[PDB]
């Protein structure tokens, strides 16, 4: 009848608790190296075979929009880019006026200035003497001031820091591991929309590989839904809230920079080289991404079927191209092998859906001065890539947006949109919750310590 | 089986698998800084309940029977509806009002049979 307190150690109980997750990178320097802007060397080796334990009987609750696993990965990548852009050249000497001339002129096309041939004065070697140099600039990075004179788009508002040409920009999968005494709970649901109970939970030491690829309007090289297209929004009745779609089957997108560029070195100071573009060997072609017309068509009819589960079974859903903003929010901007593309995704979102081989070429264009996103008076110059760029990737989702007017109207317009790379991390980490394990317990057992 | 595998099992069935959880609680760039505070934070958190488990006398044990009664005003349940009916998380949520009271009784009752055994050692 009488009971006594007995303490147990190692009892299964946990609480949600934000902590400092670290790295595990499977792809350490495989005798190949070429340090990148990320993990590589510094991220702890990953397990050959991770352990996953299926917690039976247990129904946890997930909220994909109050996750601190993505508010910590957001600042882990702003500071991985800062720490790799501090130890290399600052292009402050390049705020001279440039005497740009169109590379083609009366050469081809409508006399378009897609490329400019800009010559300027610079102090090579000695700080007194300055010789006349030249380089090839894009029309997106020179602002006419008034064979007129130009100037770099950036250097009245931001400070340029040339990216160190030895680091690689190819994303490497990253596993976010948790210290000892903490665990990450994985929702093994196949139809999970990031909020509400998950009756099939699991315990993992750290997440799967997460490529830190940042893009806008289209989530490339991501993870795919297991069963169906999944629509996830913070507040599906708010127009100011983005919508994150997730494809069950990838849509392959090929694109190139078919111009055989050539990097050339300009000495901006003693022991400091500016890597400009010398010339183009061959015909001057235009960059572009290719998407299958039929595969996109059927994958966009799967999205409209799920969009009808939240916007009425009987409604007309039409997609339209992005309205306004920076070139990164109005265009599908990505980074293909160290080269930043801003593709015109107006042929993709040009449809209208009512309730009951061929390719699409998207004219991308290249930028060389890149501003940081959530905004600072800072920019990065990406040195030219010497060669022909050609990368292929998977579209695994969209970042959509709605426009006001759905109060009396019987139609929905879905412009694409990006520009916030916090919505890039939560399209991957949506199913992970970090918990902390409390291993001490008491309970009446009718023991008694022997005196 | 596995770390936290008996999380949804009743209190009785999860007491057989203590050593699974107990053996898992220990295990200068931006990566180095956050990999170095994960190690420090994991030894100071593990030493926090080793010290606690030592002022109660249960130093090298996973189950320790103490000399303090249950008081029946902390939880007036049976010994069968507690050990096969309630999981550890449910029991913790129910008894969370009196842990700081039970914890203070566990160490004030251990440094009382530590002086009683010290007095008995002289006789």
């Amino acid at each position: 009848e009488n009971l006594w307190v007995t303490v147990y150690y190692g009892v299964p109980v946990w609480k949600d608790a934000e902590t400092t997750l670290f790295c595990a990178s499977d792809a350490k320097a495989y005798e190949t190296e070429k340090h990148n802007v990320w993990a590589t060397h510094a991220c702890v080796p990953t397990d050959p075979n991770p352990q996953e334990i299926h917690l039976e009987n247990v129904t946890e609750e997930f909220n994909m929009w109050k996750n601190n696993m993505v508010e910590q990965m957001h600042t882990d990548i702003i500071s991985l880019w800062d720490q790799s852009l501090k130890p290399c050249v600052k292009l402050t000497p390049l705020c001279v006026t440039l005497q740009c001339t169109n590379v083609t002129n009366n050469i081809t096309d409508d006399m378009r200035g897609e490329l400019k041939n800009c010559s300027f004065n610079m102090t090579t070697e000695l700080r007194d003497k300055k010789q006349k140099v030249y380089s090839l600039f894009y029309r997106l990075d020179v602002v006419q001031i008034n064979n007129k004179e130009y100037r770099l788009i950036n250097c009245n508002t931001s400070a340029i820091t040339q990216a160190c040409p030895k680091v690689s920009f190819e994303p490497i999968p990253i596993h976010y591991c948790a210290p000892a005494g903490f665990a990450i709970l994985k929702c093994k649901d196949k139809k999970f929309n990031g909020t509400g109970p998950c009756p099939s939970v699991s315990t993992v030491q750290c997440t799967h590989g997460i490529k830190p690829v940042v893009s806008t309007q289209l989530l490339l090289n991501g993870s795919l839904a297991e069963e169906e297209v999944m629509i996830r929004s913070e507040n599906i009745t708010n127009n100011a809230k983005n919508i994150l779609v997730q494809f069950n089957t990838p849509v392959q997108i090929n694109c190139t920079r078919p111009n055989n560029n050539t990097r050339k070195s300009i000495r901006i100071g003693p022991g400091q080289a500016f890597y400009a573009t010398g010339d183009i060997i061959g015909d001057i072609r235009q960059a572009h991404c290719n998407v299958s017309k039929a595969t996109w068509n059927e994958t966009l009819g799967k999205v409209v079927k799920q969009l009808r589960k939240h916007f009425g079974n009987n409604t007309i859903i039409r997609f339209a191209n992005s309205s306004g903003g920076d070139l990164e929010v109005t265009t599908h901007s990505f980074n293909c092998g160290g080269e930043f593309f801003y593709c015109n995704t107006s042929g993709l979102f040009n449809s209208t859906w009512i309730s009951n081989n061929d390719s699409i070429t998207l004219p991308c264009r290249i930028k060389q001065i890149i501003n940081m996103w959530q905004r600072i008076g800072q920019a990065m110059y990406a040195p030219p890539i010497q060669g022909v760029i050609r990368c292929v990737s998977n579209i695994t989702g969209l970042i959509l947006t709605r426009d006001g007017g759905s109060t009396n109207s019987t139609t929905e317009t879905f412009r694409p949109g990006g520009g916030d790379m916090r919505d890039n991390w939560r399209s991957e980490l949506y199913k992970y919750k970090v918990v902390k394990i409390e291993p001490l317990g008491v309970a009446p057992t009718r023991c008694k310590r022997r005196v | 089986l596995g770390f936290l595998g008996a999380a949804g099992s009743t209190m009785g069935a999860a007491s057989m698998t203590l050593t699974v959880q107990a053996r898992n609680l220990l295990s200068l760039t931006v990566w180095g800084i956050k990999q170095l505070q994960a190690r420090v934070l994991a030894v100071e958190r593990y030493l926090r309940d080793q010290q606690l488990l030592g002022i109660w006398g249960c130093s090298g044990k996973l189950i320790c029977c103490t000399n303090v009664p249950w008081n029946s005003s902390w939880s007036n349940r049976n010994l069968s509806e507690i050990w096969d009916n309630m999981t550890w998380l449910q029991w913790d949520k129910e008894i969370s009002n009196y842990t700081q009271i039970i914890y203070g009784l566990l160490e004030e009752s251990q440094n009382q049979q530590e002086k009683n055994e010290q007095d008995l050692l002289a006789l």
Partner: antibody, heavy 132, light 108 residues
Framework: QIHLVQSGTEVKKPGSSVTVSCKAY?????????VNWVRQAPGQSLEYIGQ??????????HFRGRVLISAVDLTGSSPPISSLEIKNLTSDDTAVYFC??????????????????????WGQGTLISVSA | IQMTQSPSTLSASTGDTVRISCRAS???????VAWYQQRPGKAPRLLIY???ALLGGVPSRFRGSAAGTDFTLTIGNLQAEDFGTFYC?????????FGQGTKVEVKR
């Protein structure tokens, strides 16, 4: 900014059926909230009718087989809406029905005890007058 | 379980301290008891949950207390906005149950 607004006062014949509604503004989803329906007789204490907790509905012993609780999630234009339908009205079913909601996301809350909740947010009143 | 509040009418003047009492049929050792305040022509309002835990936004004048079978509410330093029925709920066993009411009036 949780604001549950329900239907208006209605008078129903003694033997018909009713359907009370409750639109939950400020409630993100009904998988993270629990909707309990309580009723206050003209001069009595509040009486609990039923609930939808994890998309599984239930009714108390008195109302089992005689009441219906349903709820739909956030959809496009309207908020999560929960409706209570009472069949076979009696003379004693005239009371100010209340829509309630508790946040179940936190597991160590104490507003809820593993199935039974404290009512943190209340509607406003949907007084039903069953008379001839 | 069934809660039994007392007194049913507790008229008191502003500026003093008030005390409602609430005794349950059996012992509630988990402190599963919340306190609701209803004003004339309004919906109830949670003040205290988990025995004596103050819900966010409630004035710090309220102060609950749990004693296993005797749970109390103290309206210290009464204002004019704290006049109305005070209900006792218990969420220890299915289904939740309310008390009967405690009408607080003015003295004059």
């Amino acid at each position: 900014q949780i604001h549950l607004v329900q239907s208006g006062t209605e008078v129903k014949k003694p033997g018909s059926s009713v359907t009370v509604s409750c639109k939950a503004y400020g409630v993100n989803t009904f998988g993270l909230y629990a909707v309990n329906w309580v009723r206050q007789a003209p001069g009595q204490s509040l009486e609990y009718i039923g609930q939808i907790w994890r998309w599984k509905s239930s009714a108390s012993h008195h109302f089992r087989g005689r009441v219906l609780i349903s709820a739909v999630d956030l959809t496009g234009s309207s908020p999560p809406i929960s409706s209570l339908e009472i069949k076979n009205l009696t003379s004693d079913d005239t009371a100010v029905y209340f829509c309630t909601t508790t946040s179940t996301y936190d597991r160590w809350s104490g507003l809820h005890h593993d199935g039974v909740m404290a009512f943190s947010s209340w509607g406003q009143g949907t007084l039903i007058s069953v008379s001839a | 379980i069934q809660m039994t509040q007392s007194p049913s009418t507790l008229s008191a003047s502003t500026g003093d301290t008030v005390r409602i009492s609430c005794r349950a049929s059996q012992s509630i050792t988990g402190n599963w008891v919340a306190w609701y305040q209803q004003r004339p022509g309004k919906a109830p309002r949670l003040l205290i949950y988990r025995g004596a835990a103050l819900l966010g936004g409630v004035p710090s004048r309220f102060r609950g207390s749990a004693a296993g079978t005797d749970f109390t509410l103290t309206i210290g330093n009464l204002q004019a906005e704290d006049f109305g029925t005070f209900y006792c709920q218990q969420y220890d066993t299915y289904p939740g149950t309310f008390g009967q009411g405690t009408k607080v009036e003015v003295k004059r």
